DNA sequence: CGCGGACGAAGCCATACCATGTGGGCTGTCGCCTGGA
DNA sequence: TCCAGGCGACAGCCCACATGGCATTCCACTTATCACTGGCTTCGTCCGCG
């Protein structure tokens, strides 16, 4: 299951360094959130939902703000840090969570580029390699990777809460 | 001088005081049998004298001691009313009572590191890597283990017993040394048995009485191997340096 | 001049060869529980094979009366009457070696043919073979004859994974029922046992040869052995469990200086979920590569195997089939 | 002259033959629990179709004082003096003391502690035997510790009647080693080809009436059933078959309606509330002539699924015969027939139209 | 090792339940299943802090937490009222004092203990609500335990309940002399 | 009349309540094209 | 021939919910079945065979 990690994560440097180095590609390849992205991260890719879980989390990449932009945990560690740390709502990002990890494949292309987004406007780090081959493993096993977003999230959630006093 | 054979394998086990149907086996080879090993490895049929294999010394030590078990066995049975083993006077027994059941035990899965020292012992070692008869363990049924002789050439092989050997895995403390491990050596003697063979033809088996003493001796942590496959492994890296 | 024979056998659910109490006879190798048949099982279940065609490979075909070509036509003695005895020979099977006296001390006399009881000499038919004792230790049922071995080491058949015996509950119905039914025959529990056996045997070619002689006579004893020690299977509870089956590795490799097990290769028990004849036959592949290149031989290697989806390098030179195996390496043994 | 027979037949979610506690007995086969239906089950289902149709009743029993009592009292004995008299005829066979018998429960007739296994006839005989001594058997049960008075070689010998299933099955008896007939077919238990575990159904049986104020099930429990894709295997031994019954027509019936029953029948255990009668999706005949194989070796690693199994597995025992041809090379006979059109197997031989097509064509070339 | 976190989850949920509803509502509907079914995705909140760190070990947590909120009110209501035993010990307790049916019981726990690491899920949840139903003391850490220790091998935790079963039996019966 | 095969005759038998702790090893990657070194 | 650069122009920001609730009773069965065969000793005689 490591061998879509590693190729995720060539791919996360190198669309990272592309988008901020050139604006032209990075505008072109965010317009999908798709011609561009067959040009792009096509060579990195061995089911098409994996590769639609790389061009999707690339988009998603591509559509971060500058503040963002120009800057091991899953995401559910990423939401549980972005709400203990800065300000999330609990009971509002548990719910989102509740709700990305109830739906199918094709829910959580849906519902997850605004959240991931909207926490990343805020400098949280998303270990984007990983957040590609869980996209992937949403297609194998579903309730699993979901299971791992939710439990973990609440884990080191209540975990760093504790820690902290 | 000397050498190092490795007894192992799946299944070992030497005989003595039994000559009846219930056979059993002792806790840790006998040299009768394994000096009939050696010669079953030269090839000197039964009834040949064997004052060649006197002189010799076997201090063993005792990697694992290994399970006991009971081999149930029968012989003769289910064959019909006119195929059995015969009887001294020539007259078979009834089919329903012709069989002739045997219960003889053996010593499993157990591993020995035994250190001859002898003067013959070359010529033994040369023998064992080409014998002039399969060589076992125990008993003809039992195979022996493929690194039987695990060094060919090695002065003071005793020394090689108490250091730098590998061992099965064991529970080992953290940080702990002085692991025991018993070898018997031939006053302070655990027991007597009959061992030295004097003569191994089938027509009158005879042999003698032979001292022996269990010393528990301590050895290094450092000859552990791991949990598995680890064992084996160190031992083939062990027996490849033999050339050297 | 050893020929090592090793086979992977999966064997279903059934009980080959059992105890003193019902279970099958079992072996704790590295720790763990494993099951076994034992070696005279596969023995008597090999040589009542053998006897079955060798001692009938025939009757029909070769015949023992096909003789006086050396002793009772090329001799003299009634060129033309050769029936002699031939008829006088009858009122196991032998080699060659020992089929001089059948036509030697069948001559002389006088004879009686002109209308025949001389057989203490020409009975130690088994006392120089008989092949089928040298082969194999003496008979069961004749008294020793000088030659009690041997040369067909056989070992004890044990499980390349701990497998743990099965309590098969099983009872009796009676056919005639009373105004209380339900009333069973008998019930009782039988215990049972499958699994993936592994096996080995030698054959000591070298000191087998002289107790016989014709190289020719002894290159059809051992071809014959190697395939009844592939194709048979004990007859324990058979009828009942019917776990008849063929090895799905085998490998024969011939060594000119010592046989050689890989029991050995199988002591770490292999743990499951998935199949264990490929994970055997690549284990077993690995462990002949170790020792190969540990204790370096120039022998020969041979196997066959049911599976064509890994290639065994260690084994030798893959064959197509057991029986062009089997020829290939006796052929090969000289 | 070995008859092999294979099939894939795919039960739905039932419980054939239960454990001694409910659950299905289940293997542990190339590491996965496997459920499978005991040989024995099977092999009292094909006997009793056989002689069904062959009408031989061969009953196995041990009441069989009982009935020769029966017996004798239609033929005009007293019912002491029957029961009396059966008593002879069984007490008149063993060593001495006749066979072993079991503690008297009632005063009805006790029952034998072995398992006898004789046709109708046999006992209508062996009570022909005990009436052509009426006065003798009423004197012996004049004394107190009667003795054995039958001529105990025609007993014997009637002991010693076969039938289509004791010719098949064969019989055991160990106090008379001398009726002792061997079986010539090998009849191996049906595993799965796929990890099946266990599941539990909950059942409530309701009480109808109500009552007063409170109203809860009559009785609750959960019963232990299983589905999957069973693979059979049988093997007749012609040679022995013949030997035993000694004639070849007859021997040839009995192989054929052997196999058409092998194929038919299903058990009768817990059927009646699950209605899991089924057809084998694959039937594969070989005529070997040195010796019988199994395929169960081809099942060993357990299949995953998600998708079917049936096509799963009608395509690797393709796979495993073939292959496995390729290697034991063998001039044999080979036929099948296949429930499913999609695939085509070659190595199976020649594909028949049916199975009594297939069943008649490989006895017929047997 | 495993125990002293089996006590922390005893001590909470045995504490969270009476005195909140709303996870006693979230884990009631996760007996018997799946750590992953969705159905259970409401349970995490409460669980997944207390498992430490093989999957037997979270199965085992889960679903004795699910069994803790299952529990008729009658079972709470008691189990509120303010060397030790497994819950064979409690089956025998529960067979010599409340009158249940010995040849049945034994029968279940025979069947119980003689099943694989999924069997003893799918079996065991209707069980111990039925021993609640008779209000038995049943202790709940060494029932977790005991499951996180029935993967491994399942001869090492099913014997001991059942020899712990009968051991209890006949002490009771010789007891009441 | 001569005789095979099978069984049976006993010696034997055996008043000063409690326990168990274990595991670890497998796999391959790209952006392509022009320019300059 | 191989290493290195390049490849028109493609936006910035800011905000993200508060609360309240999570049920109870009941039911848990019966009976019948649980095998034998033997691995001792010699000789004489007895019933059946040729």
Redesign the interface.
Known sequence: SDYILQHADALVKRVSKLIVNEPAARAALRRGVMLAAHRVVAPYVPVHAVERAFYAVAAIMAAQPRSARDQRPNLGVSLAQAVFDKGLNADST?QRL?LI??QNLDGVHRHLPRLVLYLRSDQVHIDWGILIRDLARWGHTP??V??EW???Y??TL??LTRQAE | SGFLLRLAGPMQSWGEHSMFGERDTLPYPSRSGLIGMFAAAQGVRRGDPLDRYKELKFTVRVDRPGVRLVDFHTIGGGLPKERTVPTAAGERRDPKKATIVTSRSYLADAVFTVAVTGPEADTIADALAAPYWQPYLGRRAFVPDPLLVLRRRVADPVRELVEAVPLPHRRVEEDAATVLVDLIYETRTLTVLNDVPLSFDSKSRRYSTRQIRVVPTEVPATLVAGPGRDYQNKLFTYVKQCAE | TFVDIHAIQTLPYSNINRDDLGSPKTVVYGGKERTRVSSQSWKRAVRHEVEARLGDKAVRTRRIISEIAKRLRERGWDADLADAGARQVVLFYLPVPAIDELAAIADEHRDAVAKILPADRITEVLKSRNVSVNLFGRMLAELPSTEVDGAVQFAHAFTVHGTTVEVDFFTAVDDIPKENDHGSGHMNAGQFSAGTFYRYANVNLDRLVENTGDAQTARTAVAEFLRAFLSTVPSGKQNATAAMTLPDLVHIAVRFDRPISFAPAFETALYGSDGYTLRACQELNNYAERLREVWPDDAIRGYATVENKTDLAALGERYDSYPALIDAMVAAAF
Do not use: N, S
């Open positions: 548990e509740h990890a109830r309730r699993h979901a299971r939710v439990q973990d609440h884990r209540e975990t």
